[PDB]
Short mmCIF file of all heavy atoms in Angstrom, two decimals:
data_model
loop_
_atom_site.label_atom_id
_atom_site.label_comp_id
_atom_site.label_asym_id
_atom_site.label_seq_id
_atom_site.Cartn_x
_atom_site.Cartn_y
_atom_site.Cartn_z
N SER A 53 -21.05 13.39 14.61
CA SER A 53 -19.84 13.07 15.36
C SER A 53 -19.67 13.88 16.63
O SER A 53 -19.71 15.12 16.57
CB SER A 53 -18.64 13.28 14.43
OG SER A 53 -17.41 13.59 15.07
N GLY A 54 -19.45 13.20 17.75
CA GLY A 54 -19.19 13.85 19.03
C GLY A 54 -17.94 14.70 18.99
O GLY A 54 -17.90 15.78 19.58
N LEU A 55 -16.91 14.24 18.23
CA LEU A 55 -15.66 14.99 18.09
C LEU A 55 -15.88 16.31 17.33
O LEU A 55 -15.49 17.37 17.83
CB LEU A 55 -14.54 14.14 17.46
CG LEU A 55 -13.17 14.84 17.38
CD1 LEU A 55 -12.53 14.98 18.78
CD2 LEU A 55 -12.25 14.12 16.41
N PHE A 56 -16.53 16.25 16.15
CA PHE A 56 -16.80 17.48 15.40
C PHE A 56 -17.77 18.40 16.12
O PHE A 56 -17.62 19.62 16.04
CB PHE A 56 -17.26 17.18 13.96
CG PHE A 56 -16.14 16.60 13.12
CD1 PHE A 56 -16.30 15.39 12.46
CD2 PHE A 56 -14.95 17.31 12.93
CE1 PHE A 56 -15.28 14.87 11.65
CE2 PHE A 56 -13.91 16.76 12.16
CZ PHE A 56 -14.09 15.55 11.53
N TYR A 57 -18.74 17.83 16.87
CA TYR A 57 -19.65 18.63 17.69
C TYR A 57 -18.84 19.49 18.69
O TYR A 57 -19.11 20.70 18.84
CB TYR A 57 -20.64 17.72 18.44
CG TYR A 57 -21.49 18.47 19.44
CD1 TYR A 57 -22.47 19.37 19.02
CD2 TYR A 57 -21.30 18.30 20.81
CE1 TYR A 57 -23.25 20.07 19.94
CE2 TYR A 57 -22.07 19.00 21.74
CZ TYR A 57 -23.05 19.87 21.30
OH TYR A 57 -23.80 20.55 22.21
N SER A 58 -17.86 18.87 19.37
CA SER A 58 -17.00 19.56 20.34
C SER A 58 -16.14 20.62 19.66
O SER A 58 -16.06 21.74 20.16
CB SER A 58 -16.12 18.56 21.09
OG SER A 58 -16.91 17.77 21.97
N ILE A 59 -15.52 20.28 18.51
CA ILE A 59 -14.65 21.19 17.75
C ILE A 59 -15.39 22.44 17.30
O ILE A 59 -14.94 23.55 17.59
CB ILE A 59 -13.99 20.46 16.53
CG1 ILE A 59 -12.98 19.39 16.99
CG2 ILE A 59 -13.32 21.45 15.55
CD1 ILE A 59 -12.66 18.33 15.89
N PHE A 60 -16.52 22.27 16.62
CA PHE A 60 -17.21 23.42 16.05
C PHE A 60 -18.10 24.18 17.06
O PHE A 60 -18.61 25.24 16.70
CB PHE A 60 -17.94 23.04 14.75
CG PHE A 60 -17.00 22.43 13.72
CD1 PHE A 60 -17.22 21.15 13.21
CD2 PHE A 60 -15.89 23.14 13.25
CE1 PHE A 60 -16.35 20.59 12.27
CE2 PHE A 60 -15.02 22.57 12.31
CZ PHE A 60 -15.25 21.29 11.84
N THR A 61 -18.22 23.73 18.32
CA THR A 61 -18.93 24.54 19.34
C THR A 61 -17.89 25.35 20.11
O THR A 61 -18.24 26.22 20.92
CB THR A 61 -19.86 23.74 20.25
OG1 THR A 61 -19.17 22.61 20.78
CG2 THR A 61 -21.14 23.31 19.56
N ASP A 62 -16.60 25.10 19.83
CA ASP A 62 -15.53 25.86 20.48
C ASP A 62 -15.45 27.23 19.82
O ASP A 62 -15.27 27.30 18.60
CB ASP A 62 -14.19 25.11 20.40
CG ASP A 62 -13.09 25.90 21.05
OD1 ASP A 62 -12.92 25.77 22.28
OD2 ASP A 62 -12.44 26.70 20.35
N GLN A 63 -15.52 28.30 20.63
CA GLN A 63 -15.52 29.70 20.19
C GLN A 63 -14.35 30.08 19.26
O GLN A 63 -14.51 31.01 18.47
CB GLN A 63 -15.60 30.64 21.40
N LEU A 64 -13.20 29.39 19.34
CA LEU A 64 -12.05 29.64 18.45
C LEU A 64 -12.05 28.72 17.23
O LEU A 64 -11.83 29.18 16.11
CB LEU A 64 -10.72 29.45 19.20
CG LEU A 64 -10.12 30.65 19.89
CD1 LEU A 64 -8.81 30.27 20.53
CD2 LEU A 64 -9.90 31.82 18.93
N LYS A 65 -12.23 27.40 17.45
CA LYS A 65 -12.20 26.41 16.37
C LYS A 65 -13.40 26.50 15.43
O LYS A 65 -13.25 26.14 14.26
CB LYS A 65 -12.04 24.97 16.89
CG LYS A 65 -10.76 24.73 17.70
CD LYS A 65 -10.71 23.27 18.11
CE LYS A 65 -9.61 22.96 19.10
NZ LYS A 65 -9.85 23.54 20.44
N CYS A 66 -14.56 27.02 15.91
CA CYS A 66 -15.78 27.16 15.07
C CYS A 66 -15.51 27.97 13.80
O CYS A 66 -16.24 27.79 12.81
CB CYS A 66 -16.95 27.74 15.87
SG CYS A 66 -16.72 29.45 16.44
N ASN A 67 -14.46 28.83 13.82
CA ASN A 67 -14.08 29.73 12.73
C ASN A 67 -12.95 29.22 11.81
O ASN A 67 -12.53 29.93 10.89
CB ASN A 67 -13.73 31.12 13.29
CG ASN A 67 -14.92 31.85 13.90
OD1 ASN A 67 -14.82 32.48 14.96
ND2 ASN A 67 -16.09 31.76 13.27
N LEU A 68 -12.44 28.02 12.07
CA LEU A 68 -11.38 27.44 11.25
C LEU A 68 -11.96 26.81 9.98
O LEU A 68 -13.02 26.17 10.05
CB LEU A 68 -10.58 26.39 12.04
CG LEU A 68 -9.78 26.90 13.25
CD1 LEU A 68 -9.27 25.74 14.07
CD2 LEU A 68 -8.64 27.82 12.82
N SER A 69 -11.26 27.00 8.83
CA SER A 69 -11.68 26.44 7.55
C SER A 69 -10.93 25.12 7.27
O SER A 69 -11.27 24.40 6.33
CB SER A 69 -11.43 27.44 6.42
OG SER A 69 -10.06 27.76 6.33
N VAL A 70 -9.91 24.81 8.08
CA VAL A 70 -9.11 23.59 7.95
C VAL A 70 -8.97 22.94 9.33
O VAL A 70 -8.60 23.61 10.30
CB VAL A 70 -7.72 23.86 7.30
CG1 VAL A 70 -6.91 22.56 7.17
CG2 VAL A 70 -7.85 24.54 5.93
N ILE A 71 -9.27 21.64 9.41
CA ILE A 71 -9.12 20.83 10.62
C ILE A 71 -8.21 19.65 10.28
O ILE A 71 -8.51 18.88 9.36
CB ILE A 71 -10.49 20.38 11.22
CG1 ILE A 71 -11.39 21.59 11.64
CG2 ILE A 71 -10.31 19.35 12.38
CD1 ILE A 71 -10.89 22.56 12.82
N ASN A 72 -7.12 19.49 11.04
CA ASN A 72 -6.18 18.40 10.85
C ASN A 72 -6.45 17.31 11.88
O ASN A 72 -6.38 17.56 13.09
CB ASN A 72 -4.73 18.89 11.01
CG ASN A 72 -4.33 20.04 10.13
OD1 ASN A 72 -4.32 19.97 8.91
ND2 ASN A 72 -3.93 21.13 10.76
N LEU A 73 -6.72 16.10 11.41
CA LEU A 73 -6.94 14.98 12.32
C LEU A 73 -5.62 14.38 12.78
O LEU A 73 -4.58 14.63 12.17
CB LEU A 73 -7.83 13.89 11.68
CG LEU A 73 -9.24 14.33 11.22
CD1 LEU A 73 -10.11 13.11 10.91
CD2 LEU A 73 -9.94 15.25 12.26
N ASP A 74 -5.68 13.60 13.87
CA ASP A 74 -4.54 12.89 14.48
C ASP A 74 -3.83 12.04 13.38
O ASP A 74 -4.53 11.38 12.60
CB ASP A 74 -5.06 11.99 15.62
CG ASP A 74 -3.97 11.33 16.44
OD1 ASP A 74 -3.32 10.40 15.93
OD2 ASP A 74 -3.79 11.72 17.61
N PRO A 75 -2.48 12.08 13.28
CA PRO A 75 -1.78 11.31 12.22
C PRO A 75 -2.02 9.80 12.19
O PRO A 75 -1.76 9.20 11.16
CB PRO A 75 -0.29 11.63 12.47
CG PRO A 75 -0.23 12.13 13.86
CD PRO A 75 -1.52 12.84 14.10
N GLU A 76 -2.53 9.20 13.28
CA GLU A 76 -2.87 7.77 13.35
C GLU A 76 -4.13 7.46 12.52
O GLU A 76 -4.37 6.30 12.19
CB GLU A 76 -3.10 7.33 14.80
CG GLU A 76 -1.88 6.73 15.48
CD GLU A 76 -1.54 5.30 15.08
OE1 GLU A 76 -2.43 4.42 15.18
OE2 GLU A 76 -0.38 5.06 14.65
N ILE A 77 -4.96 8.47 12.21
CA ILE A 77 -6.21 8.25 11.46
C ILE A 77 -5.92 7.93 10.00
O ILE A 77 -5.19 8.64 9.32
CB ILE A 77 -7.24 9.41 11.66
CG1 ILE A 77 -7.56 9.63 13.17
CG2 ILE A 77 -8.55 9.17 10.86
CD1 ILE A 77 -8.06 8.35 14.01
N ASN A 78 -6.51 6.83 9.55
CA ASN A 78 -6.41 6.29 8.21
C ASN A 78 -7.39 7.03 7.26
O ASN A 78 -8.59 7.08 7.56
CB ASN A 78 -6.74 4.78 8.28
CG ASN A 78 -6.85 4.08 6.95
OD1 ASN A 78 -7.95 3.73 6.51
ND2 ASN A 78 -5.72 3.86 6.28
N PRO A 79 -6.90 7.60 6.12
CA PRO A 79 -7.80 8.32 5.19
C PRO A 79 -8.98 7.49 4.66
O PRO A 79 -10.07 8.03 4.52
CB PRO A 79 -6.87 8.73 4.04
CG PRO A 79 -5.52 8.76 4.65
CD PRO A 79 -5.50 7.65 5.65
N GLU A 80 -8.76 6.18 4.40
CA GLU A 80 -9.84 5.32 3.90
C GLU A 80 -10.95 5.13 4.95
O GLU A 80 -12.12 5.21 4.61
CB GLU A 80 -9.30 3.96 3.42
CG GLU A 80 -10.34 3.23 2.58
CD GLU A 80 -10.15 1.75 2.31
OE1 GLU A 80 -9.43 1.08 3.09
OE2 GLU A 80 -10.74 1.26 1.33
N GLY A 81 -10.57 4.90 6.21
CA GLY A 81 -11.51 4.79 7.32
C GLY A 81 -12.33 6.06 7.46
O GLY A 81 -13.55 6.00 7.64
N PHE A 82 -11.65 7.23 7.32
CA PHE A 82 -12.36 8.51 7.38
C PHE A 82 -13.34 8.65 6.22
O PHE A 82 -14.48 9.07 6.42
CB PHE A 82 -11.40 9.73 7.44
CG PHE A 82 -12.18 11.01 7.63
CD1 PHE A 82 -12.66 11.38 8.88
CD2 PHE A 82 -12.49 11.82 6.54
CE1 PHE A 82 -13.43 12.55 9.04
CE2 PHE A 82 -13.28 12.97 6.70
CZ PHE A 82 -13.75 13.32 7.94
N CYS A 83 -12.89 8.34 5.00
CA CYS A 83 -13.72 8.42 3.80
C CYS A 83 -15.02 7.58 3.92
O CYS A 83 -16.11 8.06 3.56
CB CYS A 83 -12.92 8.03 2.57
SG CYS A 83 -13.81 8.25 1.02
N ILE A 84 -14.90 6.34 4.43
CA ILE A 84 -16.03 5.42 4.65
C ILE A 84 -17.00 6.04 5.66
O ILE A 84 -18.22 6.00 5.46
CB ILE A 84 -15.49 4.03 5.12
CG1 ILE A 84 -14.90 3.24 3.92
CG2 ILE A 84 -16.59 3.19 5.84
CD1 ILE A 84 -13.91 2.19 4.32
N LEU A 85 -16.46 6.64 6.72
CA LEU A 85 -17.29 7.29 7.74
C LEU A 85 -17.94 8.57 7.27
O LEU A 85 -19.09 8.81 7.63
CB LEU A 85 -16.53 7.50 9.05
CG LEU A 85 -16.24 6.20 9.82
CD1 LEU A 85 -15.36 6.48 10.98
CD2 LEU A 85 -17.53 5.55 10.31
N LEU A 86 -17.24 9.37 6.45
CA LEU A 86 -17.82 10.60 5.88
C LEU A 86 -18.98 10.23 4.94
O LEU A 86 -20.04 10.88 4.96
CB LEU A 86 -16.72 11.42 5.14
CG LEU A 86 -17.17 12.79 4.56
CD1 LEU A 86 -17.66 13.72 5.66
CD2 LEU A 86 -16.05 13.44 3.77
N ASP A 87 -18.80 9.17 4.14
CA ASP A 87 -19.86 8.66 3.27
C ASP A 87 -21.07 8.22 4.11
O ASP A 87 -22.21 8.55 3.75
CB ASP A 87 -19.35 7.48 2.42
CG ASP A 87 -18.50 7.89 1.24
OD1 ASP A 87 -18.57 9.08 0.83
OD2 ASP A 87 -17.78 7.02 0.69
N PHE A 88 -20.83 7.50 5.23
CA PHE A 88 -21.92 7.07 6.13
C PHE A 88 -22.68 8.31 6.69
O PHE A 88 -23.91 8.31 6.77
CB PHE A 88 -21.38 6.18 7.28
CG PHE A 88 -22.38 5.97 8.39
CD1 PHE A 88 -23.46 5.11 8.21
CD2 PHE A 88 -22.29 6.69 9.59
CE1 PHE A 88 -24.44 4.98 9.21
CE2 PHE A 88 -23.26 6.54 10.58
CZ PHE A 88 -24.32 5.67 10.40
N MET A 89 -21.93 9.35 7.09
CA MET A 89 -22.57 10.56 7.64
C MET A 89 -23.62 11.11 6.70
O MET A 89 -24.72 11.43 7.12
CB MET A 89 -21.51 11.65 7.92
CG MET A 89 -20.56 11.28 9.02
SD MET A 89 -19.53 12.75 9.33
CE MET A 89 -18.17 12.01 10.27
N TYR A 90 -23.27 11.19 5.40
CA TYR A 90 -24.13 11.75 4.36
C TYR A 90 -25.12 10.78 3.72
O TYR A 90 -25.93 11.22 2.89
CB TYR A 90 -23.25 12.37 3.28
CG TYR A 90 -22.74 13.75 3.64
CD1 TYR A 90 -21.56 13.90 4.37
CD2 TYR A 90 -23.44 14.90 3.27
CE1 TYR A 90 -21.08 15.17 4.72
CE2 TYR A 90 -22.94 16.17 3.56
CZ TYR A 90 -21.77 16.30 4.29
OH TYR A 90 -21.26 17.54 4.55
N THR A 91 -25.05 9.47 4.04
CA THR A 91 -25.96 8.51 3.37
C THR A 91 -26.68 7.51 4.26
O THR A 91 -27.58 6.83 3.76
CB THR A 91 -25.18 7.67 2.30
OG1 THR A 91 -24.24 6.83 2.97
CG2 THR A 91 -24.50 8.50 1.22
#
């Protein structure tokens, strides 16, 4: 993901253990995409 690439290369955000996505993001859509990332 281009978004996570940007987040975790940031000198401050790279050290966060919790990342909150935009409230418009649907948990099911995220779950389907997280599964795709790993499979």
Side-chain angles (χ1 to χ4, degrees), residues 53-62 64-91:
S53 153
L55 185 71
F56 291 125
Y57 173 69
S58 290
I59 292 161
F60 303 122
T61 50
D62 179 87
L64 270 182
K65 300 182 189 70
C66 65
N67 294 139
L68 295 169
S69 61
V70 180
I71 299 295
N72 305 297
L73 302 193
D74 187 288
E76 265 283 306
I77 304 305
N78 173 252
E80 196 196 22
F82 185 79
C83 185
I84 284 157
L85 289 173
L86 183 61
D87 282 341
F88 167 74
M89 293 186 196
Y90 280 87
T91 66

